[PDB]
Amino acid sequence: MKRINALTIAGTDPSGGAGIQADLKTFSALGAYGCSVITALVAQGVQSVYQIDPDFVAAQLDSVFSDVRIDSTKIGMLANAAIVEAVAERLRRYRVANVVLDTVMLAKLLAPDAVEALRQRLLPQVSLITPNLPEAAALLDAPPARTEREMREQGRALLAMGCGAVLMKGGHLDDAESPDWLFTREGEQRFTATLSAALAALRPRHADWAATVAEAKDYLSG
Amino acid sequence: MKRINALTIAGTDPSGGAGIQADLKTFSALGAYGCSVITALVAQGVQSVYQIDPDFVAAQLDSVFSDVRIDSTKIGMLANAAIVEAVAERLRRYRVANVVLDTVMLAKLLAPDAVEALRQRLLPQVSLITPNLPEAAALLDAPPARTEREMREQGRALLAMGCGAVLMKGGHLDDAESPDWLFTREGEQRFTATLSAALAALRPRHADWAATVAEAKDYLSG
């Protein structure tokens, strides 16, 4: 197997359950070399006030992109708009192949101009978004989907909006055993039942997003 | 084996070779559960300018110390004096058992009041420091040691200064196969040939620092 360098750009999790820590563990478990850029603090009550220097994120980006070839990148929480701009500009200049964006910033405290910058500058540089029902609804400015039919309608609308690929996570569906739906130019796939990092790490080892999502769900199952 | 929760408080390393990333990997490899608080950016040319919000470190500390019982803690680079104060105050209030301080801030850009705060507030809360020859010399305000005799003199002077335990890393000695020297109230031990994190993770599983250092060096060897 060839060397795959995966980069996670997300919040730090002091407990290690999520954030760049869990992303790096997932990268290593799936046979990829992991780099990380901390851009926020993952929430655990509410959070206390803090800020992230965009120059701190920029120095981290200098370190990663001067040293190794980045094959794929997961993106999570970004604390402010300047950080969004810096991430989008670096990904544009280096043309990272597979960018999976966890849309946690949607439907969530955080600055609204950060979400605006995400819409304007970062989404063009993203190969795949993995929104849940509230995040997809906020991204389309539409009522949240209640059925699989509405999920597929919204996934097709997101594809038409410009996204290269969408993985609509249906867990918020009122029906138990909620499926995920993958929408790409090659079609639509239903999936039955960490995730963004697994997708980023596994995408180079496949020819499409469908097999990538399949193997990622298999790993996340056991 | 009982559950041991190790906390690393140090810089983030985007490449993963050092910093909290390598500390967490060492924690997990040595059978300890790892938490992390990012307090700086590990250097890789010189570094670009950035700052770390002390409120960001404080929010991370809130997250860690509200959730799990911390048995040991490694401390690395701290970016400014306010961060040093916050770390020292939290460790004092929670009385963390085994605090291993990597003295990278000594003999190193960084604010001098950060080093002053390290001397004033943090050193009383530290169970073990692991200085190399320049760091120990700067901590004692003395010429760097050139012989093992001078190493042991400086280790004894550091013990008399108030440190509970010192691990003088002798790698900077002009003679190859440079040894390390452990100085505690129970005596002195010579050792022949990551490290701070290994010491933090392994100290709860022993009755003294000598066996801890022995097993840590054995792990770091192979």
XYZ file of C-alpha atoms in Angstrom:
444
model
C 0.000 0.000 0.000
C 1.222 3.474 -0.938
C 1.854 6.194 1.635
C -1.218 8.347 2.322
C -0.885 11.568 4.338
C -4.177 12.700 5.880
C -4.615 16.137 7.452
C -7.325 16.989 9.981
C -8.251 20.660 10.452
C -10.683 20.826 13.356
C -11.065 21.606 17.029
C -9.006 20.118 19.814
C -10.765 17.774 22.239
C -9.086 17.708 25.675
C -10.855 14.403 26.437
C -9.873 12.777 23.132
C -13.349 11.497 22.271
C -13.619 13.709 19.183
C -11.673 16.501 17.491
C -8.239 16.199 15.939
C -7.281 13.556 18.516
C -9.963 11.090 17.417
C -9.293 12.063 13.797
C -5.604 11.170 14.147
C -6.438 7.879 15.854
C -8.831 7.055 13.001
C -6.181 8.044 10.432
C -3.634 5.721 12.031
C -6.111 2.851 12.417
C -6.947 3.035 8.693
C -3.315 2.998 7.545
C -2.753 6.711 6.919
C -0.144 9.124 8.253
C -1.809 11.941 10.156
C -1.205 15.667 10.441
C -3.369 18.081 12.408
C -4.186 21.789 12.530
C -6.123 22.949 15.591
C -8.725 25.577 14.727
C -11.191 25.586 17.660
C -12.185 23.862 20.905
C -14.687 21.003 20.691
C -17.619 21.485 23.057
C -18.170 18.975 25.862
C -23.353 23.450 30.402
C -22.075 25.881 27.798
C -18.483 26.698 26.867
C -16.443 29.580 28.218
C -15.271 32.395 25.959
C -11.981 32.022 24.083
C -10.456 32.966 20.755
C -8.083 31.356 18.262
C -5.437 33.510 16.609
C -5.665 33.116 12.808
C -1.868 33.577 12.760
C -1.641 30.460 14.955
C -3.607 28.455 12.374
C -1.450 29.981 9.628
C 1.766 28.921 11.366
C 0.363 25.396 11.729
C -0.503 25.402 8.016
C 3.029 26.554 7.159
C 4.430 23.635 9.152
C 2.206 20.983 7.551
C 2.355 22.120 3.932
C 6.105 22.774 3.897
C 6.935 19.221 5.021
C 4.697 16.521 3.502
C 2.440 15.973 0.504
C -1.168 16.069 1.728
C -3.366 13.514 -0.036
C -6.622 14.153 1.843
C -8.022 16.512 4.455
C -10.891 16.447 6.934
C -12.273 19.820 8.043
C -14.266 20.317 11.228
C -15.066 23.286 13.446
C -13.431 26.597 12.493
C -13.559 29.245 15.201
C -13.755 32.451 13.134
C -13.920 33.817 9.601
C -10.217 34.641 9.231
C -9.394 30.995 9.989
C -11.898 29.926 7.323
C -10.217 32.252 4.809
C -6.730 30.963 5.621
C -7.801 27.309 5.383
C -9.604 27.878 2.076
C -6.675 29.798 0.578
C -4.099 27.171 1.562
C -6.253 24.324 0.232
C -6.740 26.267 -3.011
C -3.033 26.991 -3.496
C -2.027 23.391 -2.770
C -5.036 21.738 -4.499
C -5.572 19.009 -1.920
C -7.232 16.072 -3.649
C -9.942 14.873 -1.241
C -11.401 17.440 1.169
C -14.171 16.111 3.421
C -15.974 18.871 5.320
C -17.859 18.011 8.498
C -20.524 20.735 8.441
C -20.634 21.106 12.238
C -20.414 24.896 11.809
C -23.858 24.871 10.180
C -26.894 24.907 12.486
C -24.896 25.784 15.592
C -21.612 31.249 20.065
C -19.919 31.120 16.661
C -19.667 34.161 14.427
C -22.147 34.277 11.514
C -19.491 35.768 9.235
C -17.559 32.552 9.871
C -20.457 30.617 8.314
C -20.605 33.194 5.517
C -16.895 32.699 4.789
C -17.452 28.932 4.875
C -20.155 29.311 2.222
C -18.122 31.707 0.070
C -14.515 30.477 0.143
C -14.314 26.973 1.610
C -17.186 25.077 -0.042
C -15.619 25.472 -3.538
C -12.497 23.688 -2.228
C -14.381 20.745 -0.654
C -14.846 17.373 -2.362
C -17.487 16.010 0.028
C -19.729 17.370 2.776
C -21.280 15.127 5.438
C -24.260 17.103 6.761
C -26.943 15.836 9.071
C -30.550 16.943 8.627
C -30.295 20.318 10.461
C -26.968 21.138 8.795
C -28.255 20.263 5.320
C -31.449 22.237 5.964
C -29.428 25.286 7.015
C -27.170 24.862 3.980
C -30.176 24.784 1.624
C -32.276 27.287 3.628
C -35.205 24.876 3.725
C -37.262 23.032 6.339
C -35.479 19.958 7.710
C -36.255 16.728 5.892
C -38.649 14.317 7.604
C -38.625 11.401 5.123
C -36.037 9.602 3.024
C -37.762 11.099 -0.025
C -37.120 14.594 1.332
C -33.559 13.558 2.226
C -32.934 12.557 -1.385
C -34.589 15.722 -2.697
C -32.298 17.813 -0.498
C -29.244 15.777 -1.499
C -30.022 16.345 -5.170
C -30.552 20.054 -4.468
C -27.150 20.183 -2.759
C -25.555 18.442 -5.747
C -27.168 21.033 -8.023
C -25.958 23.757 -5.653
C -22.380 22.867 -6.579
C -21.176 20.250 -4.098
C -19.164 17.491 -5.743
C -20.503 14.896 -3.334
C -22.881 14.831 -0.367
C -23.262 12.267 2.414
C -26.559 13.083 4.119
C -26.522 11.455 7.554
C -30.092 10.461 8.333
C -29.708 9.688 12.042
C -31.987 12.627 12.872
C -34.859 10.852 11.086
C -37.722 10.021 13.440
C -37.620 6.404 12.241
C -35.091 4.194 14.004
C -32.402 2.410 11.981
C -31.946 5.640 10.054
C -29.879 5.308 6.851
C -27.291 7.548 5.227
C -27.569 8.680 1.608
C -24.620 9.346 -0.702
C -25.176 11.651 -3.690
C -22.515 11.996 -6.393
C -22.526 12.663 -10.126
C -22.484 8.866 -10.534
C -25.779 8.539 -8.645
C -27.228 7.810 -5.205
C -26.501 5.069 -2.676
C -28.286 4.075 0.523
C -26.260 2.929 3.536
C -27.544 1.045 6.583
C -26.163 1.083 10.118
C -14.424 9.464 13.152
C -16.650 9.288 10.065
C -15.239 12.310 8.232
C -11.684 11.327 9.172
C -12.337 7.753 8.026
C -13.667 9.025 4.693
C -10.631 11.272 4.237
C -8.195 8.480 5.093
C -9.880 5.878 2.884
C -10.753 7.928 -0.218
C -7.268 7.628 -1.840
C -7.550 3.820 -1.608
C -10.681 3.675 -3.798
C -11.990 4.835 -7.170
C -15.229 6.446 -5.946
C -16.965 7.718 -2.832
C -19.377 4.759 -2.643
C -16.745 2.105 -1.899
C -15.020 4.609 0.405
C -18.198 5.138 2.441
C -18.813 1.379 2.456
C -15.396 0.536 3.911
C -15.620 3.460 6.353
C -18.982 2.255 7.680
C -17.584 -1.281 7.923
C -14.687 -0.013 10.048
C -16.997 2.095 12.224
C -19.179 -1.000 12.762
C -16.558 -3.640 13.583
C -3.900 -2.858 36.071
C -5.756 0.156 37.455
C -6.934 3.026 35.265
C -4.344 5.804 34.917
C -5.318 9.143 33.352
C -2.326 11.086 32.021
C -2.579 14.724 30.935
C -0.118 16.416 28.580
C 0.077 20.226 28.623
C 2.393 21.249 25.800
C 2.569 22.578 22.272
C 0.799 21.112 19.284
C 2.944 19.502 16.588
C 1.264 19.579 13.152
C 3.626 16.811 11.973
C 3.019 14.594 15.015
C 6.688 13.903 15.740
C 6.567 15.687 19.103
C 4.143 17.796 21.131
C 0.852 16.631 22.582
C 0.388 14.226 19.659
C 3.509 12.198 20.449
C 2.712 12.525 24.159
C -0.741 10.994 23.643
C 0.689 8.187 21.517
C 3.233 7.460 24.264
C 0.477 7.564 26.907
C -1.596 5.032 24.974
C 1.382 2.771 24.236
C 2.216 2.607 27.962
C -1.325 1.716 29.046
C -2.583 5.132 30.162
C -5.625 7.155 29.132
C -4.560 10.472 27.650
C -5.874 14.014 27.865
C -4.242 17.044 26.271
C -4.156 20.822 26.663
C -2.520 22.737 23.814
C -0.461 25.674 25.060
C 1.918 26.556 22.187
C 3.182 25.512 18.753
C 6.191 23.186 18.610
C 8.943 24.539 16.370
C 9.931 22.586 13.259
C 14.094 28.548 9.436
C 12.405 30.312 12.328
C 8.736 30.288 13.313
C 6.162 32.879 12.338
C 4.499 35.083 14.941
C 1.368 33.833 16.706
C -0.266 34.006 20.111
C -2.252 31.647 22.331
C -5.241 33.007 24.226
C -4.891 32.152 27.941
C -8.704 31.863 28.001
C -8.357 29.087 25.401
C -6.007 27.167 27.713
C -8.381 27.863 30.611
C -11.355 26.449 28.703
C -9.304 23.342 27.884
C -8.406 23.012 31.576
C -12.082 23.335 32.534
C -12.921 20.498 30.145
C -10.206 18.132 31.402
C -10.524 18.719 35.139
C -14.329 18.627 35.213
C -14.474 15.167 33.607
C -11.737 12.768 34.777
C -9.378 12.264 37.702
C -5.873 13.219 36.550
C -3.200 10.920 37.981
C -0.154 12.423 36.249
C 0.731 15.339 33.999
C 3.526 16.164 31.573
C 4.217 19.859 30.949
C 6.034 21.156 27.887
C 6.218 24.497 26.102
C 3.989 27.270 27.473
C 3.569 30.236 25.150
C 3.170 33.109 27.635
C 3.116 33.990 31.322
C -0.671 34.027 31.751
C -0.787 30.428 30.496
C 1.912 29.510 33.025
C -0.152 31.107 35.809
C -3.336 29.293 34.784
C -1.579 25.915 34.539
C 0.125 26.368 37.916
C -3.099 27.466 39.621
C -5.134 24.550 38.256
C -2.453 22.019 39.217
C -2.308 23.561 42.700
C -6.077 23.485 43.229
C -6.381 19.891 42.009
C -3.087 18.630 43.539
C -2.070 16.430 40.620
C 0.148 13.661 41.958
C 3.006 13.345 39.446
C 3.911 16.447 37.425
C 6.855 15.994 35.050
C 8.068 19.280 33.567
C 10.041 19.238 30.327
C 12.131 22.391 30.787
C 12.117 23.287 27.077
C 11.178 26.869 28.013
C 14.583 27.289 29.669
C 17.525 28.221 27.429
C 15.353 29.108 24.444
C 11.020 34.393 20.710
C 9.428 33.480 24.042
C 8.625 36.085 26.663
C 11.074 36.281 29.598
C 8.211 36.910 32.023
C 6.926 33.498 30.931
C 10.163 31.965 32.251
C 9.849 34.120 35.372
C 6.314 32.826 35.977
C 7.585 29.283 35.390
C 10.199 29.813 38.105
C 7.771 31.458 40.534
C 4.469 29.578 40.248
C 4.926 26.333 38.318
C 8.132 24.819 39.735
C 6.565 24.428 43.232
C 3.828 22.270 41.651
C 6.222 19.986 39.718
C 7.351 16.567 40.960
C 10.173 16.075 38.442
C 12.074 18.200 35.934
C 13.993 16.680 33.013
C 16.519 19.354 32.010
C 19.365 18.951 29.585
C 22.697 20.663 30.222
C 21.772 24.141 28.859
C 18.372 24.072 30.576
C 19.849 23.000 33.918
C 22.594 25.620 33.589
C 20.010 28.337 32.934
C 17.916 27.078 35.854
C 20.912 27.263 38.217
C 22.464 30.372 36.599
C 25.800 28.605 36.214
C 28.139 27.564 33.402
C 26.964 24.419 31.605
C 28.371 21.182 32.979
C 31.163 19.532 30.987
C 31.733 16.357 33.051
C 29.569 13.826 34.852
C 31.013 15.201 38.099
C 29.692 18.658 37.218
C 26.386 17.086 36.145
C 26.013 15.504 39.579
C 27.045 18.721 41.330
C 24.364 20.610 39.403
C 21.774 17.906 40.079
C 22.476 18.112 43.803
C 22.273 21.913 43.617
C 18.887 21.614 41.897
C 17.697 19.211 44.599
C 18.811 21.731 47.227
C 17.067 24.466 45.231
C 13.740 22.787 45.981
C 13.030 20.347 43.153
C 11.610 17.056 44.383
C 13.391 15.119 41.662
C 15.697 15.915 38.745
C 16.529 13.873 35.648
C 19.584 15.532 34.113
C 19.816 14.407 30.489
C 23.500 14.235 29.630
C 23.223 13.912 25.846
C 24.882 17.319 25.452
C 28.065 15.906 27.018
C 31.004 15.968 24.612
C 31.617 12.271 25.309
C 29.537 9.875 23.229
C 27.269 7.348 24.956
C 26.225 10.140 27.297
C 24.304 8.985 30.398
C 21.354 10.443 32.276
C 21.456 11.107 36.018
C 18.465 10.874 38.358
C 18.606 12.816 41.637
C 15.965 12.273 44.327
C 15.896 12.418 48.115
C 16.592 8.665 48.005
C 19.863 9.237 46.133
C 21.380 9.273 42.646
C 21.161 6.812 39.759
C 23.062 6.623 36.479
C 21.254 5.527 33.312
C 22.837 4.356 30.055
C 21.428 4.605 26.540
C 8.256 10.900 24.514
C 10.514 10.740 27.577
C 8.572 13.157 29.784
C 5.260 11.644 28.673
C 6.605 8.141 29.332
C 7.709 9.181 32.824
C 4.303 10.719 33.541
C 2.439 7.652 32.282
C 4.623 5.149 34.140
C 5.126 6.890 37.503
C 1.786 5.707 39.023
C 2.794 2.091 38.282
C 5.922 2.258 40.473
C 7.028 3.180 43.987
C 9.879 5.536 43.036
C 11.296 7.528 40.146
C 14.231 5.142 39.591
C 12.150 2.157 38.459
C 9.944 4.570 36.492
C 12.933 5.972 34.589
C 14.261 2.440 34.073
C 11.051 1.158 32.472
C 10.676 4.374 30.452
C 14.189 4.030 29.019
C 13.495 0.358 28.281
C 10.380 1.319 26.309
C 12.212 4.108 24.469
C 14.942 1.593 23.546
C 12.867 -1.367 22.341
